[PDB]
Amino acid sequence: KVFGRCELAAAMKRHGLDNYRGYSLGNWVCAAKFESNFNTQATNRNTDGSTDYGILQINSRWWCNDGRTPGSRNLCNIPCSALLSSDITASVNCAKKIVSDGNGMNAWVAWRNRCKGTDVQAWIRGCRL
């Protein structure tokens, strides 16, 4: 599924991401935009054996188990395929774990480079929340 901007914002708000650990909703929409272009089936297969899965491109080395990545920790305790659903619940719950386990939103390269220091409020502006 390829989400619309306001549709994703609404779903992320229902899952309680607005101000989660101090990060406004717009930050989460912006990160998903430049990580996956809002595509829930996005997959990026890397040369180190790992793969990035789903709308937030969560990496298989630490966070989910796909049975093919060395040194897997599966810290979100899910198969990576669960991150490729049209329902974003699994990706949101794992993302909450990623930010809270010390890292913050710096964990997402796309957020660090294309959202940090910008008017992230623009990504939810005009939407029905």
Side-chain angles (χ1 to χ4, degrees), residues 6-57:
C6 294
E7 289 74 6
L8 185 63
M12 283 180 158
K13 184 163 170 53
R14 290 193 298 269
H15 286 91
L17 278 182
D18 188 27
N19 199 30
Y20 181 84
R21 296 298 301 269
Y23 291 103
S24 64
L25 187 64
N27 283 288
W28 300 93
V29 178
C30 184
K33 166 57 177 186
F34 294 107
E35 285 292 348
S36 70
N37 214 1
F38 297 155
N39 184 1
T40 64
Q41 288 177 342
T43 62
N44 181 60
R45 312 197 170 275
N46 305 292
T47 62
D48 72 342
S50 74
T51 299
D52 305 317
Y53 289 93
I55 195 158
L56 286 170
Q57 289 289 276

Side-chain angles (χ1 to χ4, degrees), residues 11 15 55 78 82-83 85-96:
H15 286 91
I55 195 158
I78 49 162
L83 301 177
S85 171
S86 60
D87 161 38
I88 63 163
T89 299
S91 290
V92 169
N93 289 343
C94 190
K96 292 176 175 178

